[PDB]
């Protein structure tokens, strides 16, 4: 079996410009587990991100999180890039909800 990753990019607090915040990538429903996750600012990896340990809930779906401090300013493009198995690396752009 092979399931594609569902990928969700969001901030801990509402994406207000100029306010320090936490960028978060939650990745789930991928199978088999082999997967890589990066958070980037304008295509440049942000240093100091954390990745939770691989784990799953009761319907056997894997899930992983990566997060990093960030401070979102206009015109900056924040991105989660996901590489699952040998599939091509796929990029998902953080969109503020305000």
């Amino acid at each position: 079996r092979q399931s594609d990753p569902k990928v969700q990019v969001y901030s801990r607090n509402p994406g207000e410009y100029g306010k320090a915040n936490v960028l978060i990538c939650y990745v789930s429903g991928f199978h088999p587990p082999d997967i890589t996750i990066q958070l980037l600012k304008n295509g440049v990896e942000i240093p100091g991100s954390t990745q939770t340990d691989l784990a799953f809930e009761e319907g056997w779906q894997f899930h992983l999180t990566k997060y990093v401090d960030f401070l979102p300013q206009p015109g900056e493009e924040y991105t989660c890039r996901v590489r699952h198995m040998s599939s091509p690396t796929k990029s998902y752009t953080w969109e503020p909800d305000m």
């Binding site: 079996r1 399931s3 969700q8 969001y10 801990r12 607090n13 509402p14 994406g15 207000e16 410009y17 936490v22 978060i24 939650y26 199978h31 088999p32 587990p33 082999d34 997967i35 890589t36 954390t50 939770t52 340990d53 691989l54 784990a55 799953f56 809930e57 009761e58 056997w60 779906q61 894997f62 999180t65 997060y67 206009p74 503020p96 909800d97 305000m98």
Partner: protein, 274 residues
């Protein structure tokens, strides 16, 4: 409160990015321990478990988990054969655990799955294993002849509850913490849909309701998923998708309910980057 102790084992025959065998331990679905086949060592992941269990605990936990890795390594070569699959990446997954309520009552489960799909699972009411296909019936017959359910049930109802109670004691401040949501009404532009955002809360149970003129309104509402933040807390949002002319002719509010607390937001609260 209700508290649970669970273990999730991810075993993988032919992967690259991850160790062969990963074990994670959780109290209230929060990691408190980790182990994998690269380190061959079981380590702490919370302060309360490291302050409260010394070298002897981590030694015997590593021993048990090196036994789990070996049993997995064998276990997965057989299930591949039964399914006629001599080539490839395949996963073996195991999750079991405890629940202890306010009642004093207890619950538990013990489950396995192959390639992400139910293999066998314990019913400790009847001491029988539920097979999900012929390929699993071979295991059901073996384990029921061997009193594996007897051991597993003793573990879930006594041993795992005993360890659970110590763990809620060790971690009593974190585990019993009650943190309120920070709630906001968001809008990208003056005509955009409006978003009720709730974040920073624990436990994970939240209720987000929209209201039209003081009454609950479940039209045009997109309740988002329960998501985690980077600390033990969670966030969830809901979106009302109505034309701002319906916004004119009506008084919409958002209501967020969490634990013993209730927060309310109206159009006067709308923040925005625009």
């Amino acid at each position: 409160g209700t508290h649970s102790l669970k273990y999730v084992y991810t075993g993988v025959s032919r992967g690259i990015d991850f160790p062969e065998f990963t074990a994670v331990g959780m109290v209230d679905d929060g990691q408190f321990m980790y182990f994998d086949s690269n380190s061959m060592k079981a380590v702490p992941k919370t302060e309360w478990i490291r302050q409260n269990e010394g070298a002897d605990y981590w030694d015997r936990q590593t021993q048990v988990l090196i036994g789990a890795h070996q049993v997995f390594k064998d276990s997965i070569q057989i299930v591949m054969e039964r399914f006629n699959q001599s080539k490839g990446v395949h996963t073996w997954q195991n999750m079991y655990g405890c629940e202890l309520n306010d009642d004093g009552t207890t619950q538990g489960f013990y489950q396995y799955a192959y390639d992400g799909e139910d293999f066998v699972s314990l019913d400790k009411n009847t001491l029988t294993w539920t097979a999900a296909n012929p390929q699993a019936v071979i295991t059901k017959h073996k384990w029921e002849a061997l009193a594996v359910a007897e051991q597993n049930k003793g573990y879930l109802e006594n041993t795992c509850i005993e360890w659970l109670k110590k763990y809620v004691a060790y971690g009593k401040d974190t585990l019993e913490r009650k943190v309120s949501p920070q709630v906001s009404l968001l809008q990208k532009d003056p005509s955009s849909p409006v978003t009720c955002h709730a974040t920073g809360f624990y436990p994970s149970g939240v209720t987000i309701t929209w209201q039209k003129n003081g009454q609950d309104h479940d039209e045009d509402v997109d309740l988002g998923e329960l998501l985690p933040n980077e600390d033990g807390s969670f966030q969830r949002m809901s979106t009302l998708n109505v034309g701002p002319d319906e916004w004119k002719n009506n008084r919409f509010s958002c209501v967020v309910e969490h634990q013993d607390k209730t927060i309310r937001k109206t159009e006067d609260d709308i923040i925005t980057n625009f």
